[PDB]
Amino acid sequence: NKCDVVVVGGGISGMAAAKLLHDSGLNVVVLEARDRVGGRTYTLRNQKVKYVDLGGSYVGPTQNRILRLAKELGLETYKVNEVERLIHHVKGKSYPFRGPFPPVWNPITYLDHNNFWRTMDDMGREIPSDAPWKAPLAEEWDNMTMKELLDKLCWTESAKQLATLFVNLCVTAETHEVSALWFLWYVKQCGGTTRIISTTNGGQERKFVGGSGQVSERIMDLLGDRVKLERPVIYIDQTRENVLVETLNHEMYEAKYVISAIPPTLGMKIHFNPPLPMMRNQMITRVPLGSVIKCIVYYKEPFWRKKDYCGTMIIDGEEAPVAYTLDDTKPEGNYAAIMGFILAHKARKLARLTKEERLKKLCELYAKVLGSLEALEPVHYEEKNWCEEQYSGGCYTTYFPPGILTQYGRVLRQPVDRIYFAGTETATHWSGYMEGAVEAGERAAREILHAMGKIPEDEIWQSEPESVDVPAQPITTTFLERHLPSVPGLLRLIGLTTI
Amino acid sequence: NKCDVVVVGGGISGMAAAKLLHDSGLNVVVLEARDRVGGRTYTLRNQKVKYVDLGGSYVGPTQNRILRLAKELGLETYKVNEVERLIHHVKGKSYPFRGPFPPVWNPITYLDHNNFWRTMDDMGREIPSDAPWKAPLAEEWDNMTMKELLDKLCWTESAKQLATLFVNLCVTAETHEVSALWFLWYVKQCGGTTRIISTTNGGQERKFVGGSGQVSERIMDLLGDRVKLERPVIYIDQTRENVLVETLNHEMYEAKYVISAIPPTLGMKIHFNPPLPMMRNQMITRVPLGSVIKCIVYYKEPFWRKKDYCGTMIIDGEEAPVAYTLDDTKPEGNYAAIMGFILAHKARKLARLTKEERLKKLCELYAKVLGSLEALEPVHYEEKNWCEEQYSGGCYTTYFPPGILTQYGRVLRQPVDRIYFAGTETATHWSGYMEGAVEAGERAAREILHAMGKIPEDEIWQSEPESVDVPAQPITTTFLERHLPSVPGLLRLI
Numbered sequence: 001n002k003c004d005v006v007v008v009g010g011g012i013s014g015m016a017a018a019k020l021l022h023d024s025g026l027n028v029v030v031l032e033a034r035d036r037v038g039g040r041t042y043t044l045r046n047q048k049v050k051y052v053d054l055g056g057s058y059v060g061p062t063q064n065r066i067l068r069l070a071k072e073l074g075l076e077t078y079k080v081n082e083v084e085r086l087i088h089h090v091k092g093k094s095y096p097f098r099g100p101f102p103p104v105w106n107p108i109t110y111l112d113h114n115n116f117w118r119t120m121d122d123m124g125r126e127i128p129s130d131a132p133w134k135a136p137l138a139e140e141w142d143n144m145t146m147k148e149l150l151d152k153l154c155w156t157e158s159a160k161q162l163a164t165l166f167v168n169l170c171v172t173a174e175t176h177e178v179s180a181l182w183f184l185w186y187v188k189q190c191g192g193t194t195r196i197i198s199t200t201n202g203g204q205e206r207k208f209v210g211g212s213g214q215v216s217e218r219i220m221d222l223l224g225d226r227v228k229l230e231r232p233v234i235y236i237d238q239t240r241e242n243v244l245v246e247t248l249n250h251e252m253y254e255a256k257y258v259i260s261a262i263p264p265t266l267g268m269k270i271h272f273n274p275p276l277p278m279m280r281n282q283m284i285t286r287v288p289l290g291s292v293i294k295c296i297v298y299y300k301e302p303f304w305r306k307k308d309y310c311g312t313m314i315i316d317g318e319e320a321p322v323a324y325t326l327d328d329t330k331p332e333g334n335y336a337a338i339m340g341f342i343l344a345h346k347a348r349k350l351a352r353l354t355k356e357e358r359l360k361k362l363c364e365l366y367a368k369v370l371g372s373l374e375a376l377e378p379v380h381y382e383e384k385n386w387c388e389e390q391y392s393g394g395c396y397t398t399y400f401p402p403g404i405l406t407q408y409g410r411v412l413r414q415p416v417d418r419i420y421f422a423g424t425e426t427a428t429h430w431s432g433y434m435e436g437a438v439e440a441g442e443r444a445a446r447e448i449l450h451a452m453g454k455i456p457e458d459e460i461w462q463s464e465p466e467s468v469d470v471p472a473q474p475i476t477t478t479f480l481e482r483h484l485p486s487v488p489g490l491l492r493l494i495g496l497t498t499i
Numbered sequence: 500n501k502c503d504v505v506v507v508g509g510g511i512s513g514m515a516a517a518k519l520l521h522d523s524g525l526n527v528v529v530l531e532a533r534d535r536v537g538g539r540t541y542t543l544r545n546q547k548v549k550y551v552d553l554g555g556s557y558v559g560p561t562q563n564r565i566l567r568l569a570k571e572l573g574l575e576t577y578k579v580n581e582v583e584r585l586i587h588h589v590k591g592k593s594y595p596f597r598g599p600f601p602p603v604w605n606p607i608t609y610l611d612h613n614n615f616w617r618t619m620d621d622m623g624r625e626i627p628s629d630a631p632w633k634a635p636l637a638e639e640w641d642n643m644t645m646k647e648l649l650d651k652l653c654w655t656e657s658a659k660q661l662a663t664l665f666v667n668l669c670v671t672a673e674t675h676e677v678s679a680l681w682f683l684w685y686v687k688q689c690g691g692t693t694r695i696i697s698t699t700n701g702g703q704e705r706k707f708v709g710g711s712g713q714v715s716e717r718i719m720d721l722l723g724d725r726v727k728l729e730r731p732v733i734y735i736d737q738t739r740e741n742v743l744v745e746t747l748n749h750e751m752y753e754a755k756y757v758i759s760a761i762p763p764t765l766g767m768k769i770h771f772n773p774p775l776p777m778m779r780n781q782m783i784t785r786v787p788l789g790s791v792i793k794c795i796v797y798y799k800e801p802f803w804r805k806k807d808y809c810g811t812m813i814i815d816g817e818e819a820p821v822a823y824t825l826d827d828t829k830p831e832g833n834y835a836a837i838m839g840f841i842l843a844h845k846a847r848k849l850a851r852l853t854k855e856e857r858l859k860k861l862c863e864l865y866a867k868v869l870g871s872l873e874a875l876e877p878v879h880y881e882e883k884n885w886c887e888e889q890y891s892g893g894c895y896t897t898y899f900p901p902g903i904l905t906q907y908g909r910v911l912r913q914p915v916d917r918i919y920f921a922g923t924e925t926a927t928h929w930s931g932y933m934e935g936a937v938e939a940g941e942r943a944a945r946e947i948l949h950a951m952g953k954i955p956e957d958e959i960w961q962s963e964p965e966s967v968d969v970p971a972q973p974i975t976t977t978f979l980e981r982h983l984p985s986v987p988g989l990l991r992l993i
C-alpha cells in the first residue's frame with residue numbers, strides 16, 4: 001500500500017532502479033504488468049533448447065553497467081562464436097571473409113563504402129549524446145529520413161544496399177521511417193559504427209551463461225514480494241500529498257515518488273491526473289518501436305564450423321527473410337543453432353505465415369548461404385515476434401520519425417512533478433540496449449535520492465569502472481581509411497586536373 | 500450494465516453512431532471520458548463571446564452528412580464572411596485580391612504555382628479514397644515526405660513557401676513530418692485543392708448558428724442518460740460470450756458489440772484482452788495528431804470591412820504566429836472577431852508564452868496585415884491549445900509519417916472480433932472533418948447492424964442526398980491552367 005518509490009515496469013531498467021533504491025534502505029514496490037519480469041529480455045527454458053534468449057541477449061566491451069550488475073548477481077558471460085569465417089551473401093553468392101566489415105574490391109565501390117561509414121562517424125561527432133537536438137545542424141538532419149541521407153551520400157548501389165541493411169539491422173525500421181539525426185545519434189551513442197557492428201570487440205561479443213532473463217529474475221529474487229506481477233498500471237494521480245498509482249486489478253499504491261520504467265509510448269496506457277504537460281502528452285504518440293521476429297533454428301551439430309564458417313551471415317536483398325545471423329550454439333558446443341532476425345517490413349510481411357512456413361524459408365535460405373544441405377535438417381525451432389507484445393510495443397527499441405527528436409527530445413527524461421523516467425530510451429550510452437536500461441534505471445533512482453536530499457546533484461550521473469572480465473580495445477582506423485577521398489571528392493579531383 | 504452496443508467516445512462520430520443505433524431500437528451506452536461531449540468540437544459560451552467554436556467549426560458544400568444531421572437536430576448555418584477582398588501578405592506587404600487563389604504575377608512563377616496545384620490533383624486521381632495503399636505508386640509516394648515532394652516539384656521559392664503554408668494549414672504538421680501519399684490522399688478525399696481551400700463553394704463556406712458543439716449536445720439530449728460522462732474506458736475484454744468494457748471509475752458494461760469512436764492512437768489508453776492483433780498493436784503507436792492553437796481576437800467593430808477587406812489573411816513566412824485567418828464575426832454583424840490558427844512547430848514554440856503574450860503578437864500581426872491601428876485595440880480573446888488534450892492528442896486530425904499508411908493503412912477500420920471502428924480517421928470523404936466523423940460513425944453502426952442480420956451487406960456504405968440549403972457548384976479549370984507547361988516542361992521546350 002504505502003512505500004517510498006513505486007517503480008512502474010520490471011524490466012532491466014525498472015529492476016536496476018528498484019535494487020539501487022532498496023540497497024539504500026528505501027521501500028520500493030515494482031509494479032510489473034506481465035506474469036514475468038525481464039520485459040524485452042526473455043529467456044525460454046525447455047528440454048530441447050535448455051535455455052534460449054528470445055529477446056535481448058548480447059553484451060560486449062564498453063557496456064560496463066550491465067556487466068557489473070550481472071556479475072554481482074553471480075552471472076557469467078561467454079564469447080559468441082567468431083573463430084571461423086564470416087559470410088556476406090550479395091546477389092545470390094556467398095563471399096566468406098574475416099574482420100568486422102565485409103570487404104570490397106572495386107576501387108570506386110571501395111571509396112564509397114569507406115566514405116559512407118566514415119561520414120556516419122564524422123556526422124556523429126557533432127551530436128551531443130545527452131542532447132542530440134543541440135547538434136549544430138540538428139534541424140536539417142532531423143527533417144530528413146535516413147533514406148534521403150543514403151541517397152545523398154552513397155554514389156554506389158552496393159554501398160546503399162549495405163547501408164540500408166545496416167539501418168534495418170540496428171534499429172529494426174526502414175530507412176525512410178526514421179530521422180537521420182536520431183539514427184546518427186543512436187549509433188554515435190553506442191560508440192560508433194565499429195563498436196556497434198562488431199562481434200569481437202563490439203556490442204555482440206558475448207551472451208550470459210543461462211540467459212539474460214536471469215538479470216531481472218535474480219533482482220526479483222532479492223526484492224522478494226516487493227515485485228508485483230500482473231499489475232498493469234492504469235492510473236497515476238499527483239493532485240494530493242502522496243502520489244497514487246492504481247493497477248488494472250484495482251490495487252492502489254501510495255508513494256513519495258514514481259519511476260516510469262516502461263517504453264515512452266507505453267505511457268499512453270496510463271491515465272494521468274493532472275493531465276501530462278502538453279509536450280509529453282504529444283511526445284508519447286510520436287515515438288513507436290521497431291519490428292522484429294527473433295528466430296533460432298537448432299541442428300544436431302554446428303556443421304558450418306566444419307566448412308570454416310563461424311555462423312555469421314550478412315545477407316543482402318529483398319528475397320532473404322533474415323538479413324543477419326549469429327552462431328547461437330552453447331559454449332559447451334551443444335544445442336548447435338543459428339540465430340537470425342526478420343526485420344522491419346519483413347517482420348510485418350512474414351508474420352502472415354505459420355511458424356512451420358517461416359522455419360522452412362529460413363532453412364532454405366541458410367542452406368543456400370552456407371552451401372549445405374544439412375541446413376535443411378533442423379532438429380528444433382524457437383521464435384518470438386515482438387510486434388505482438390502489448391507491453392513492449394515492439395523491439396529492440398523506440399525509433400524517432402523525421403522532425404520528432406528536435407521538437408520533443410528534451411521531454412524524454414524531464415521529470416513530471418514526482419514522476420522520474422528510466423527505461424533504456426532515456427539512456428545516453430547504449431540507449432536501446434540492456435546497458436542503457438541499467439544506466440537509465442540507476443540514474444532515475446539517483447534523481448529521486450537527490451530530490452530526497454540523500455545525495456548531492458553531482459552524484460546523479462555516475463561513471464562506471466571498466467569491466468576486468470570484458471575489457472575494451474580502442475577503435476582504430478588506418479591512414480588510407482581516414483584520408484581516401486569520397487566518390488564526388490575523387491570526381492572533383494579528376495575535374496581539377498582538366499582545369 | 501447490459502446493452503446491445505457500447506460506443507467508446509462521445510464526439511460527433513460516437514454520437515452519430517449511437518443515434519443511428521438507438522433510432523433502430525437497439526440499446527446503446529456512450530462512454531465519454533471527459534465531463535462534456537463534442538470532443539474536437541467544443542463551443543464555449545460566455546457573455547463576452549456569446550458563443551465561440553474553439554474546435555471544429557467550418558462546414559461547406561459536399562459535406563452532406565454533417566449538414567443533414569445538424570439540420571435534423573434543428574441547427575442552422577450561416578455563411579463565413581467573404582464579401583470584400585482577401586489579403587495575401589508576402590515579404591511584409593499586403594496584396595488584396597478576389598477569388599480563392601492568391602494571384603501571382605511573374606510569368607515563370609505563375610507557371611510553377613499553376614503546375615504545383617495541378618500536380619497535387621493529378622497525383623490524387625490515382626489514389627483510391629477507400630484504399631490509398633492501392634495507388635499504383637503507393638510505396639514510392641509513401642516513402643517520401645511532403646518536403647521531398649515539394650523540393651522536387653517547386654522550381655520557385657515562392658511556390659514552395661505557399662505549398663508549405665498549404666500543408667501546414669491543412670494538416671497542422673510540417674511537410675517533413677508527413678507522407679506524401681497520405682497528404683495527397685487527404686486532399687483528394689476532400690474533393691481536391693480547390694474544394695479544400697475555398698470559403699465560397701468549399702470546406703470553409705459556413706459555420707453553425709450557435710456553435711458546432713450543439714451537434715453532440717443535442718444528440719446527448721436525445722439519448723438522455725445513455726451517455727455516460729467522465730467514463731474513461733481503461734479495459735476491453737472479448738474472451739467471454741459478451742464484450743466487457745471497464746471504465747476508470749470502476750464501472751463495468753456488457754454488450755454484444757463495441758464501437759471505438761476515439762482517435763486511432765488513443766486506443767493505446769485501453770488495455771485489451773486478448774491482446775490486439777500485431778498490426779493494430781503497432782499501428783496505434785504510429786499515427787500521431789497534429790499541433791494547433793485556435794485563437795480568436797475580438798474587436799468593437801469588424802473594422803476591416805470598412806477598408807474593403809473580408810478578414811481573410813494568407814500570411815507567408817516564419818515570423819508570423821498565424822499563417823491564416825477568417826472573419827469570425829456573428830451573422831448579425833456583432834461580436835466582431837478574427838479567427839486564426841497557430842500551426843505545427845509554431846504551436847509548440849508559442850505555447851511557452853502566456854496568453855497575453857500571444858494576444859499581443861497576434862494583434863501586432865493583424866495591425867500590419869490589415870494596415871490598421873484598430874487591430875491593436877482588442878476587446879476580448881479566447882484561445883485553445885489542443886496539444887494539451889489527453890483525450891484528443893491534438894487537432895485537427897491524425898497524420899501518417901512516411902512508411903506507415905502503406906504498411907498499416909488497411910488496419911484502420913478492420914474490425915477486431917466484436918470491436919468496430921468509427922472516428923473521423925476511418926472515413927473516405929472529408930476524413931479529418933466533422934463530415935467524416937458522421938460518415939464513419941454511421942458506417943460502423945451499420946456494420947454492427949449487418950453483423951446482427953438486420954441489413955444486407957450492400958447497405959453498410961450508404962450515399963447521402965445533396966443538401967438543398969448548401970448546394971455544390973462544380974470545380975472548374977480554365978484551358979490555360981490545364982495545359983500551360985511546368986517550369987521544367989518549358990525548359991525542355993525552349
Ligand SMILES: *[C]C1=C([C])[C]=[C@@]23C(=[C]1)N([C][C]([O])[C]([O])[C]([O])[C]OP([O])(=O)OP([O])(=O)O[C][C]1O[C](N4[C]=NC5=C4N=[C]N=C5[N])[C]([O])[C]1[O])C1=NC(=O)[N]C(=O)C1=N2/C3=[C]\[C]=[N+](/[C])[C]1[C][C]C2=C1[C]=C([O])[C]=[C]2
Nearest residue numbers: 508510512532538539555556557732894922923931932933
Ligand atoms: C481541434 C480542431 C480544431 C482547432 C479545428 C478544426 C477541427 C478540430 N476539425 C476536426 C473536427 O473537429 C474533428 O474531425 C471531429 O470533431 C472528429 O470527431 P470524432 O471522430 O468523433 O472524434 P473526437 O471528436 O475526438 O471524439 C472522440 C471522443 O472520445 C473521447 N475519448 C477519448 N479516449 C477515450 C474517450 N472516451 C472514453 N474512453 C476513452 N479512453 C474524447 O473525449 C472525445 O469526446 C474541423 N472539422 C471540420 O469539419 N471543420 C473545421 O473547421 C474543423 N476545424 C479545423 C478546420 C480548419 N480548416 C478548415 C482550415 C482553414 C483553412 C484551411 C483549412 C484546411 C484546409 O484544408 C485548407 C485551408
Ligand SMILES: *Cc1cc2c(cc1C)nc1c(=O)[nH]c(=O)nc-1n2C[C@H](O)[C@H](O)[C@H](O)COP(=O)(O)OP(=O)(O)OC[C@H]1O[C@@H](n2cnc3c(N)ncnc32)[C@H](O)[C@@H]1O
Nearest residue numbers: 009011012013033039040056057058233395424432433434
Ligand atoms: C526485443 C529485443 C530486444 C533486444 C534485442 C533483440 C530483441 C528481439 N537484442 C538486444 C541485445 O542483443 N543486447 C541488448 O543489450 N539489448 C537488446 N535488445 C533490447 C533490450 O532487450 C532492451 O533494451 C532492454 O531489455 C530494455 O529494458 P527496459 O527495462 O529499459 O524496458 P522493458 O525491457 O521493455 O521493460 C518494461 C517493463 O514494463 C512493463 N510494462 C509496460 N507497461 C506497463 C504498465 N502500464 N504497468 C506496469 N508494467 C508495464 C513491461 O512488461 C516490461 O516488463
